[PDB]
Chains A and B, each alone.
Chain A
Amino acid sequence: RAHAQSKREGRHSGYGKRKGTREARLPSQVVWIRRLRVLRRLLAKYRDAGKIDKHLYHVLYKESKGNAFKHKRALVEHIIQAKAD
Chain B
Amino acid sequence: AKRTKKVGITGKYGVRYGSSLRRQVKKLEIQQHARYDCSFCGKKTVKRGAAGIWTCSCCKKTVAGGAYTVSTAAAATVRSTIRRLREMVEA
Complex contact flag A–B (Cβ < 8 Å)? no
The residues of A with any CB-CB pair to B shorter than 8 Å are: none
Binding site for A on B (CB under 8 A): none
